[PDB]
Amino acid sequence: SMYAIRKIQFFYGPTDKKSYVGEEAGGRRELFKTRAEAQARIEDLEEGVYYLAHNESGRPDYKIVWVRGE
RNA sequence: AUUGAAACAGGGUCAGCUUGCCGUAGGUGGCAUCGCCCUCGU
């Protein structure tokens, strides 16, 4: 259906929270038809240096997911 | 008898481990400072 990415973020202190990708801006969460686009998207996020926020434990984990077509 | 009274952004985390400005290339070739006059006049 609609392929996309699940986003998880681990903070120091056992807590941690979840949100998709594409919730940054006016555009809603972004939708890819093919898993290949999602794989490339994962790669290009993994490419760069990662700048930690405050009270952040380690580099985030992305996993791939297809969401039922909205 | 104040929608008041009490209310830590806290606890730590190397910018690091390294690389030749090198190998050469001319200040040369060459033109007379010359041609000339009193120290006399007692």
The distance (Å) linking the CA of A28 with the C1' of B35 is: 108
Give the neighbor-by-neighbor strand order of the sheet with A61-67: A16-20, A2-10, A61-67
Both tokens assigned to A54: 């405050």
**A49, closest nucleotide (Cα–C1'):** B15
- Tokens 């120091």 belong to A12
Q: Resolution of the coordinates in A?
A: 3.4
Q: Separation of CA A17 and C1' B39 in angstroms? A: 125
Indicate the length of chain A as a whole number: 70
Cα-Cα end-to-end distance for chain A: 9
| Strand B nearby residues, CB < 7 A | A 12-13, 52, 54-55
User: How many Å from the CA of A23 to C1' of B38?
Assistant: 121
> How was it solved?
cryo-EM
Calculate the alpha carbon distances from A65 to A5, A7, A42, A51 in Å: 6, 10, 12, 25
